[PDB]
Structure formats: C-alpha cells, structure tokens
C-alpha cells in the first residue's frame, strides 16, 4: 500500500535559516580544512527537501 | 518324472500433478479522505469491487 496525504515544496529563495545552522556555518574555517565541513554533516547532513 | 513351472510379474504405477495459481490486483484511488483511501484501496479477495 502507497498511501499518499500531502504535496509539500519549499520556496525557492530567501530561506529564512535555522539558528543552530546559521552559527555553525558562522564557525566553519575560511581556509579548507575537510574535518570542519565534515562535522558539520555529521550534525545537520548533506541535503535539504 | 518331472515337472517345470517359471512365474513371472511386473507392474508399474506412475502418477503426476501440478497446480498454478495466480491472483494480481491493483485498486488506484485520487482524492478523497486518506483513510478512506486506504481503506477501499485495500483489496477484499471477496469483493474486489
């Protein structure tokens, strides 16, 4: 059974974005460096819907 | 005096059958409430209407 209730989109520009992911992006280090950006996939991931 | 008598029987039974039974459906639904839905997209085998 596939059961289907609700169609939801994003809007495609201006998001207002949370806080917590606001400040750790505010954190990340402006030279490369993999283990921040890789931090902060392990918290918040890769995609959004 | 003598006497001679050879018997000799041989019998073979072989028996075989097969049954295929197939029953596909797919009930589709758009609109209406989503139990509603489910609930008559869910295929009675007695009553598939």
Known sequence: SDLEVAHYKLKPRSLMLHYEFLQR??????EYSYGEYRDLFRDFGTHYI | SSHGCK??????????????????????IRGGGAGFISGLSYLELDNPA
Do not use: H
Request: charged share 25%; net charge positive; proline share 7%.
């Open chain 2, 7 to 28: 018997e000799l029987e041989n019998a073979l039974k072989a028996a075989s059958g097969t049954q295929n039974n197939v029953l596909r459906g797919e009930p589709f």
């Open chain 1, 25 to 30: 992006v505010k954190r990340l280090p402006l």
